[PDB]
């Protein structure tokens, strides 16, 4: 929230390429830690600056960019799996107040690019059905807010 509020673009580009390199190794570490020491948050803190940098622009002419490279690195951030940007993401979706701007950014990102594969859209629709399955598990009394946020 400060090294991304750091208004220099390319240092944030370094930081999100570091983020992509640690994003490449999120499965090696089940036995890579010390055996015995297994027995004896990064997502929501970064998606906001990702769309903030999307909004921001600069005249990069030395074979660099601002919005375009950030677009491509968010794509490569989610080119793996829509559920690996959901299962590590639905854990942090319980604050309604924040969720309003969250779903607002999620509207603006696909408002920005607009051209996207259709398999991820159909599987997102399937994961909305999964959200309804969670609704069956947790009925409460709410609904109008959820159906507006979806529709």
């Amino acid at each position: 929230m400060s090294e991304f509020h750091h208004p220099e673009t390319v240092q944030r580009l370094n930081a999100v390429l570091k983020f992509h390199t640690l994003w490449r190794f999120r499965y090696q570490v089940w036995p890579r830690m010390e055996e015995g020491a297994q027995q004896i948050a990064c997502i929501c803190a970064a998606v906001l600056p990702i769309v903030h940098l999307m909004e921001d622009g600069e005249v990069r002419e030395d074979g660099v960019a601002v919005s375009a490279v950030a677009q491509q690195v968010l794509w490569n951030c989610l080119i793996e799996d829509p559920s690996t940007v959901l299962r590590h993401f639905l854990e942090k979706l319980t604050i309604s107040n924040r969720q309003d701007e969250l779903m607002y950014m999620l509207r603006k990102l696909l408002l920005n690019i607009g051209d996207f594969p259709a398999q991820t859209s159909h599987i997102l629709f399937n994961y909305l059905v999964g959200l309804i399955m969670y609704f069956v598990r947790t009925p409460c009394e709410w609904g109008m807010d959820a159906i507006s946020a979806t529709l």
Partner: peptide, 15 residues
């Protein structure tokens, strides 16, 4: 149980 996580919501299981 449907999602297969090994657990079932307490309000749903009660109701």
């Amino acid at each position: 149980d449907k999602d297969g996580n090994g657990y079932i919501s307490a309000a749903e299981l009660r109701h």
